[PDB]
Nucleic acid binder design. Structure first.
Length: 82
RNA sequence: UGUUC
């Protein structure tokens, strides 16, 4: 799998945590280019997604963030395309 | 619901 630069995997996304709220958090690190929430074939969120930036970010530092939204702690990692 | 509908 390839590690995608300037992109963060985000799991544990509550179904109420919408794009605006995701950007509200991640904007502290840069200008968000894309938020992609992965859904199943009926459009139901799988509870994870990918946030990418226009600027260079330190992904290893971002993934250290301890943060909770809607009573779920976010599960962060580098983004890998299998 | 853990790595790209």
């Amino acid at each position: 799998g390839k590690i995608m630069p300037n992109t963060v995997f985000v799991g544990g996304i509550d179904v109420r945590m919408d794009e605006t709220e995701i950007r509200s958090f991640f904007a502290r690190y840069g200008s968000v280019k894309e938020v992609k929430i992965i859904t199943d074939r009926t459009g139901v969120s799988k509870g994870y997604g990918f946030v990418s930036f226009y600027n260079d970010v330190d992904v290893q530092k971002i993934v250290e963030s301890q943060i909770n939204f809607h009573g779920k702690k976010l599960k962060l990692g580098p983004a890998i395309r299998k």
